[PDB]
Amino acid sequence: PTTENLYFQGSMNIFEMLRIDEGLRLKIYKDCEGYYTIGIGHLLTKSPDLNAAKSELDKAIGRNCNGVITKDEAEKLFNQDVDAAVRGILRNAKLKPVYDSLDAVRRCAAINHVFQMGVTGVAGFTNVLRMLQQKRWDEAAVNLAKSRWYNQCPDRAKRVITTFRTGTWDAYKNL
Ligand SMILES: c1ccc2oncc2c1
């Protein structure tokens, strides 16, 4: 690794990670599963009614957005969503011990997974959680690759899986 390469891990954190996985959109769009989304992976609603999505948006941002937000607003919402995922792990009796056992990079992948799937979805992954706690990284990654989460939308999940396998930021290099 060059001096620059060794600097790369210091540039990566959960925010940069999810920013790559989720992208950044300032207008309401449908995600790979067809759910109305905005900003940096902010799921507005699962309802197919755009009017519901717009309603959720105005509630979340606090003004009349008519389906459009600013970069600064996207980032505020993103920060709130990241905090919610972290809080969701730490208060959960199943997830916290696993999260605690992980190194810093895999902890980012954990927060990412929960940001994407929610707490009950992740906590239901009984085998993966045991594998991670036991540092069975290859097995954990293979099992994650069986999931609907990954298989229905591979591009959004592939880097997270690789990160659980390696505990490095390599999947986020060379975009
Ligand atoms: C919180 C703790 C451990 C985890 O493993 N995979 C996701 C996740 C979330």
Swiss-Prot record:
Localization: Host cytoplasm
Hydrolase found in the keyword field: yes
Enzyme type, top EC level: hydrolase
Gene Ontology MF term list: lysozyme activity
Residues reported in the UniProt entry to bind substrate: 43, 115, 128, 143
UniProt induction comment: Expressed late in the viral replication.
Major place of residence: host cell
Consequence the record notes for mutating residue 31 to E/Q: Loss of 99% of enzymatic activity
Residues at the active site: 22, 31
Keywords of this entry: Antimicrobial, Bacteriolytic enzyme, Cytolysis, Glycosidase, Host cell lysis by virus, Host cytoplasm, Hydrolase, Viral release from host cell
GO biological process: cell wall macromolecule catabolic process; defense response to bacterium; peptidoglycan catabolic process; viral release from host cell by cytolysis
Phenotype for residue 22 to N: Loss of 84% of enzymatic activity
PANTHER family: T4-TYPE LYSOZYME 1-RELATED
Function description: Endolysin with lysozyme activity that degrades host peptidoglycans and participates with the holin and spanin proteins in the sequential events which lead to the programmed host cell lysis releasing the mature viral particles. Once the holin has permeabilized the host cell membrane, the endolysin can reach the periplasm and break down the peptidoglycan layer.
Family recorded in the similarity comment: Belongs to the glycosyl hydrolase 24 family.
HAMAP family, alphabetized: ENDOLYSIN_T4
Protein's UniProt name: Endolysin
Species per Swiss-Prot/TrEMBL record: Enterobacteria phage T4 (Bacteriophage T4)
